[PDB]
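Notebook B, p. 112. Complex prediction, attempt 2.
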Amino acid sequence: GRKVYPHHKGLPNGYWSNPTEDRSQQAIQGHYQEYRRPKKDGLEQRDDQNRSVKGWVKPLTEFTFEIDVTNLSEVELGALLWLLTLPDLHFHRLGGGKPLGFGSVRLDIDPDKT
RNA sequence: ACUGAAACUGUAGUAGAACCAAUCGGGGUCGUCAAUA
């Protein structure tokens, strides 16, 4: 079917904090810092198998955008608004590094602007 | 068995009307590899 990257539920507090620290060789609440390359012999494994990011967009930062739609049926609109009004703790998966846990996002309609 | 003369092919008329250079596409992501003895 369609490949999807399920939301990384239950990541511990501080899992994403201070990411330049190699914590991957140590359990914290049972998680192992999957998003970071491990050290090898104490030096960073920057090679052609992975990439580096100079930064990322922090958790809890907010974006607004608009969707303009034309001639949607109620079924087509219902599917869209269903995706835009999912129950709590349902998250979309956006951008790169999704299998590392990056890019889980909360989408909800702003009704006053709709 | 005495050359006619003299007379601007000019005058008026917009190569133009209409037509979206555009449609679709997350800068993304995980299992080996190799063939003999």
